[PDB]
């Protein structure tokens, strides 16, 4: 099925407090597996999933060097963009970088992406053709001009289509028993009478992986929904996720409402009622 290896890099400048803070996290699908935080004397790339301890000392040394070099490059990038926009030394600013692969069901490279953000807004983006760029403004056009001069898209195309795809295959094998094992949600409906006329029905989905899920309060046509609320999928803290959907129904119309749950770990979709 579809799989992705993603790196999310964040660099925030500290006015008057030293060098910028740099944090990098790596994901395989919805599983974080590595971290780098430069707020240390000797920061190292460290595993964030247990199956990554199967990698030797040189692997961690190489990623540690790659991450420390990136932190320095982002410190230069912060100074550069701050000069592009005529911004003072007193302002704290953020440069964000997401990078990675996506595989299709066929297992081969499907889509790559490399995007830059300055202060929470789009800045520089590599297009899906992996040969052109999109600059958000006049400043980012200078960065695009530098990227074309250095054949940056050519080097990114080789990383996104080859180096990144090969290591995603290596990570899916080491974390095989956890990455490729689908966890179906555990589902139940709760009932709380808001008043003598109406009642809340809440459909729960607990402990599922991956995060993609659909919770729907289906209805037989004759339900008179008074209110509804879906919550964002949230991490349970143990590698799995949670979600619930609620609906305010006239008391006496509970049976007209069914909860439909879709998830890759389910052999069939699940329907459940109070």
């Amino acid at each position: 099925g579809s799989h992705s290896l993603k790196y999310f890099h964040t660099s925030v400048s500290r006015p008057g407090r030293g060098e910028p803070r740099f944090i990098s996290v790596g994901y395989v699908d919805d599983t974080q597996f590595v971290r780098f935080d430069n707020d240390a004397a000797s920061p190292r790339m460290v595993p964030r999933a247990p199956w990554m301890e199967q990698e030797g000392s040189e692997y961690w040394d190489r990623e540690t060097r790659s991450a420390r070099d990136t932190a320095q490059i982002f410190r230069v990038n912060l100074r550069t963009l701050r000069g592009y926009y005529n911004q003072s030394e007193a302002g704290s600013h953020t440069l964000q970088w997401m990078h990675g692969c996506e595989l299709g069901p066929d297992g081969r490279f499907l889509r790559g992406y490399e995007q830059f953000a300055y202060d929470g807004k789009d800045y520089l983006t590599l297009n899906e053709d992996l040969r052109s760029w999109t600059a958000v403004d006049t400043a980012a056009q200078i960065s695009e001009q530098k990227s074309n001069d250095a054949s940056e898209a050519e080097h990114q195309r080789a990383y996104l289509e080859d180096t990144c795809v090969e290591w995603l295959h290596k990570y899916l094998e080491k974390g095989k028993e956890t990455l490729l094992h689908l966890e179906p949600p555990k589902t139940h409906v709760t009932h709380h009478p808001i008043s003598d006329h109406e009642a809340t029905l809440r459909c729960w989905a607990l402990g599922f992986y991956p995060a993609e899920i659909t919770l729907t309060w289906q209805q037989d046509g004759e339900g008179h929904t008074q209110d509804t609320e879906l919550v964002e999928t949230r991490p349970a803290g143990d590698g799995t996720f949670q979600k619930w959907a609620a609906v305010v129904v006239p008391s006496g119309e509970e049976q007209r409402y069914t909860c439909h749950v879709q998830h890759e770990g389910l052999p069939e979709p699940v329907t459940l009622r109070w």
Binding site: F8, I23, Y27, Q96, K121
Partner: peptide, 14 residues
């Protein structure tokens, strides 16, 4: 948890 962000560059933490 470690600082990460979504498709719209907004951060999330647990």
């Amino acid at each position: 948890s470690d600082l990460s962000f979504s498709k719209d560059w907004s951060f999330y933490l647990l």
